[PDB]
Amino acid sequence: GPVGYSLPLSPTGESAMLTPPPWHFSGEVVMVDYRVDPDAARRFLPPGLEPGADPGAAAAVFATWQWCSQDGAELTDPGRCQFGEFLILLSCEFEGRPMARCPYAWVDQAVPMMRGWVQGMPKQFGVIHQSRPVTVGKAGSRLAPGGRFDGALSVHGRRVVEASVTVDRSTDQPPALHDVPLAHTLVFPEWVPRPRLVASEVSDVEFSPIWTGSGDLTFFDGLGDDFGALAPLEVGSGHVFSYGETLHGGRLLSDYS
Amino acid sequence: GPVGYSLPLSPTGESAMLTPPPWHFSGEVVMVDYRVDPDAARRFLPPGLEPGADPGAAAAVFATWQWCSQDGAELTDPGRCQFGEFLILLSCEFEGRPMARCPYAWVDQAVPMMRGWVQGMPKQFGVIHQSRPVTVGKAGSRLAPGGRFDGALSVHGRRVVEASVTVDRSTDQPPALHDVPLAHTLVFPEWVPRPRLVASEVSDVEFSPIWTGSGDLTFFDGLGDDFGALAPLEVGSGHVFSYGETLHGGRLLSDYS
Amino acid sequence: PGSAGPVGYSLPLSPTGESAMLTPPPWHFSGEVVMVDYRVDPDAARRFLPPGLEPGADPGAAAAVFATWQWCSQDGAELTDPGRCQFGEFLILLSCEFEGRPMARCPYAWVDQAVPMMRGWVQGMPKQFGVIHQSRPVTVGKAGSRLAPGGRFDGALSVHGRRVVEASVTVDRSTDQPPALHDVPLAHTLVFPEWVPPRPRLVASEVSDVEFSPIWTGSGDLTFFDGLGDDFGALAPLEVGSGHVFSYGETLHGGRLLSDYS
Amino acid sequence: PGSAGPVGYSLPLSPTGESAMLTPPPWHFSGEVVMVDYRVDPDAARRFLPPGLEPGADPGAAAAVFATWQWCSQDGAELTDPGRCQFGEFLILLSCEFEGRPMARCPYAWVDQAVPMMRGWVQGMPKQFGVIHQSRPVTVGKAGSRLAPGGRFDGALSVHGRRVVEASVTVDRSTDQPPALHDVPLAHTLVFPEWVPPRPRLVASEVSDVEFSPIWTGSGDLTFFDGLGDDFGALAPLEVGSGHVFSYGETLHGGRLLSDYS
Ligand SMILES: *[C@H](/C=C/c1c[nH]cn1)C(=O)O
Ligand SMILES: *[C@H](/C=C/c1c[nH]cn1)C(=O)O
Ligand SMILES: *[C@H](/C=C/c1c[nH]cn1)C(=O)O
Ligand SMILES: *[C@H](/C=C/c1c[nH]cn1)C(=O)O
């Protein structure tokens, strides 16, 4: 019968929407660290994920990505291999080890959206915009002191997050929540009448120099009270950097059995 | 911990991208019946699904839908509750009973796309356009003899299906492939190192009068040789009609155990 | 007859004229409308009326109009490509008069397709780009409303990712009385920026073959939100009146000069 | 000083002028370009040149240009809204001359945002709407190419859901020599359809502060596909030459009249 890594199945397996991992990612990031209500954050952590050594540490992350499979085939079609993303990260721990939980994410392309659910990453669809550094002319900011970079997310036609960073210095210190494993919940609805906690296994994690400065972050109404509970109490430092990793598959943290 | 019918999980369950069934659908359809190579069609049928009593009977279906949950809440936001769809149907049988297999489908909204995979319906993302009947003025066709209606699908910026119907008469005879159960394969990729054949359980199936006439259908390159194998050998009658159903959940046809 | 360079009704010019983005008029329109009548600050509305246009007989009468359209040129060629011949629109209409005759001024319009947007500027309709959603009546199933008493229909406009207008109509009854602001000539201002170091003209859109379906009428609701600036906000509803759901057709031929201010 | 009705640099007019879709120039541009030089049928190209523009010193020189831009007005206000200040573009350029001076003619352009599209017509650039994709260089990870020898960069244009141009560049070396067609004035035709029963003008875009990054150059590949008509197809490549990847900036001030054909 027909085969494939994913739907649609086909006689050769070529029609599948998704390709098997590993997948490579190369992205540009605009990120703001912030303080979240720790009691709100705790309510987004499933069993096994405990509050972070700093329970109120969170981050808002805008990124633009290119991705490809092991053969690099997608790279020659920029429309296929590019997407934009916004996500929230919360600090947590699993068996005493620091991790990050992503309670919310949005992307602007279908393949990444579905692939997110494969990994347990709770992606929905949104419109996501992000400033890009310039090196010539006057219509933008250089990656240099005083450079400003903005991000915005709209969902169903309503503007729900805006962030800004004005950088003042370069460092070699990766932002903490972007340098720990992500712990996701793998679950799909049961169509015919069992969640698993998993971590994304990565290799070849790489950061550019990190441009850091002031951060600004505002949440707006339009995603509901549960999301609103994660709005910043205080906003910290911003960071602008490039990031790469290879995603291989999942490792089980717990199946609650 | 956080809950929900689907991701993202949240403390109240309100953040979930998908709502539990049942879901109601009301749609406008432009459909063309056609002859497919039966040996090509057979290769898209998984174990348990056997060739149709007429193995070469296929259909190309364009539809525009409104949908909602049991509470009707989505109806007040037309941007949330509308989508367009194109799908291929193939005639098959399960345990001697006529059914339809959908080997390929595309939609233009994220919620329906994900919900399709919940049901085993192999939806990907596309750009889908469809003529609408008019009742005033000159810029369109009436639902009346001589009225013409067109459909088009583009995927990743390449035009891959065009269809047309010019209607000549109204009937009370629902198109055969739109009036049998759909048999889907429920399978998700395994992220941490088992397909099921299921049928969609529906109620309250309703057709408007069926406007029927000549059909035209062309496939173009741009989805690969596996899809191309289902191109029409001959094109039959076209149909333009409205359709409603309520989708409740899945029933297991086989888990291959 | 004695033409040299490339030609065309509009840019881009080409040797045959076939490449032009726009076709010459007339253009035919067939649409579905969800409209809400409302009361505007008359003094605010007046400031949007150029010289030559006087306040309407009822200076506070305004309307918010959602429509989805199919259009084509005389030859009908666009109809076979639904992606090319369809667009959604949201308009504000204000009541006014030219030399004693009732007309409507459209101070703001949005559409979701490029050809209509540019063609709007040709006619003086001040179209910008937006995301526009509108309920459609259904006739089978449960996922929507029928054109019948109790039927509800909604419209929403977002611009640059910010929700700026929402309207709703719940219809009670059918009538043969077209809504006043949808049944009078539109008076636009033709002006285009001058690139080489503008002379506006007041024009009316000349139409024929205007046609309405029966009008379904009932309660209206309308809300403006922030995100288009204070000039737009000045036209927000003081009070909201009746809503209407109907189909509309017309043929647009060209402009008739009301004043060139000579 | 003595102004009555509503005002604005462009439609829509408003009491303060704040609602206008377009801002007055100058406008600043900062972009990333993927460009392929190619050989065009010179006789085909000539038919796209209006009176006053002569064939280029090399009449068969043409280029296909993909660019992604950020832009802003003098005050920089648009930069804080990336959705408002970014757009993608695809252009064809043809070599020509005005009174002995090298210039470039743009017979066709597409963009993916409404403000740039309309602003194009203000300047005479014949912009239509399309879907435009372009590779970006990466500096970390494996999912892309570096600006370095061996780096590959692709561009694609689709119009009305049909793929019409694809280009690729694989760079070998860096130079300080800007590609010829990207380093000469653009000569456009200003014309807008007449609504009330056109006078074209040949203009050059006046720019300052033109700036290039180092130019990465290598092999070029370019393919045109059906779906924009035979007039466009006449400009398809006979031969394809070098490709170039670079960053570009300029400030656009207004038009300079080359001929009003008086
Ligand atoms: C979704 C997200 C991938 C990712 C990796 N880091 C951050 N986001 C996908 O495309 O699989
Ligand atoms: C996807 C498809 C639903 C459907 C029902 N009939 C045809 N397509 C979804 O929205 O769940
Ligand atoms: C723009 C708008 C046309 C129109 C006619 N009635 C309402 N709107 C266009 O497409 O020309
Ligand atoms: C349209 C195009 C501007 C431009 C400048 N160089 C290349 N394209 C606009 O946004 O005005």
mmCIF file of N, CA, C and O and ligand atoms in Angstrom, chain C residues 29 69 87 89 116 119-120 123 125 127 250, ligand 3:
data_model
loop_
_atom_site.group_PDB
_atom_site.id
_atom_site.type_symbol
_atom_site.label_atom_id
_atom_site.label_comp_id
_atom_site.label_asym_id
_atom_site.label_seq_id
_atom_site.Cartn_x
_atom_site.Cartn_y
_atom_site.Cartn_z
ATOM 1 N N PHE C 29 -20.057 44.911 -12.248
ATOM 2 C CA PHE C 29 -19.899 44.464 -10.861
ATOM 3 C C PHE C 29 -21.138 43.701 -10.406
ATOM 4 O O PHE C 29 -22.276 44.128 -10.685
ATOM 5 N N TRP C 69 -17.289 41.173 -4.138
ATOM 6 C CA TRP C 69 -17.601 41.437 -5.537
ATOM 7 C C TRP C 69 -16.994 40.410 -6.493
ATOM 8 O O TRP C 69 -15.913 39.872 -6.246
ATOM 9 N N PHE C 87 -12.992 40.317 -5.342
ATOM 10 C CA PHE C 87 -12.361 41.089 -4.258
ATOM 11 C C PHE C 87 -13.349 41.434 -3.170
ATOM 12 O O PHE C 87 -14.541 41.429 -3.393
ATOM 13 N N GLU C 89 -14.340 44.317 -0.044
ATOM 14 C CA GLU C 89 -14.276 45.778 0.131
ATOM 15 C C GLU C 89 -14.963 46.218 1.411
ATOM 16 O O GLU C 89 -15.937 45.622 1.824
ATOM 17 N N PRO C 116 -8.291 46.061 -8.210
ATOM 18 C CA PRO C 116 -9.310 46.990 -7.717
ATOM 19 C C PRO C 116 -8.727 48.201 -6.996
ATOM 20 O O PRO C 116 -9.282 49.302 -7.151
ATOM 21 N N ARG C 119 -7.487 50.635 -9.663
ATOM 22 C CA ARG C 119 -8.631 51.094 -10.429
ATOM 23 C C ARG C 119 -9.472 52.069 -9.599
ATOM 24 O O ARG C 119 -10.093 52.987 -10.144
ATOM 25 N N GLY C 120 -9.515 51.854 -8.289
ATOM 26 C CA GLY C 120 -10.141 52.816 -7.392
ATOM 27 C C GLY C 120 -9.545 54.204 -7.550
ATOM 28 O O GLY C 120 -10.281 55.201 -7.700
ATOM 29 N N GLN C 123 -10.679 56.189 -10.521
ATOM 30 C CA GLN C 123 -12.028 56.764 -10.361
ATOM 31 C C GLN C 123 -12.142 57.792 -9.223
ATOM 32 O O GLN C 123 -13.165 58.486 -9.079
ATOM 33 N N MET C 125 -11.833 56.879 -6.038
ATOM 34 C CA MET C 125 -12.247 56.216 -4.811
ATOM 35 C C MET C 125 -10.982 55.935 -4.012
ATOM 36 O O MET C 125 -10.066 55.294 -4.531
ATOM 37 N N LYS C 127 -9.115 54.024 -2.205
ATOM 38 C CA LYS C 127 -8.855 52.691 -1.724
ATOM 39 C C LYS C 127 -7.456 52.481 -1.155
ATOM 40 O O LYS C 127 -6.438 52.926 -1.730
ATOM 41 N N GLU C 250 -24.032 46.721 -10.808
ATOM 42 C CA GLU C 250 -23.985 47.967 -11.576
ATOM 43 C C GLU C 250 -22.920 47.863 -12.649
ATOM 44 O O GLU C 250 -22.003 47.038 -12.547
HETATM 45 C C1 LIG E 3 -13.054 49.503 -7.031
HETATM 46 C C2 LIG E 3 -14.405 49.609 -6.415
HETATM 47 C C3 LIG E 3 -15.502 49.451 -7.222
HETATM 48 C C4 LIG E 3 -16.838 49.566 -6.580
HETATM 49 C C5 LIG E 3 -18.075 49.705 -7.230
HETATM 50 N N1 LIG E 3 -19.014 49.761 -6.263
HETATM 51 C C6 LIG E 3 -18.412 49.643 -5.067
HETATM 52 N N2 LIG E 3 -17.084 49.513 -5.254
HETATM 53 C C7 LIG E 3 -12.871 48.855 -8.346
HETATM 54 O O1 LIG E 3 -12.689 47.616 -8.398
HETATM 55 O O2 LIG E 3 -12.880 49.549 -9.391
#
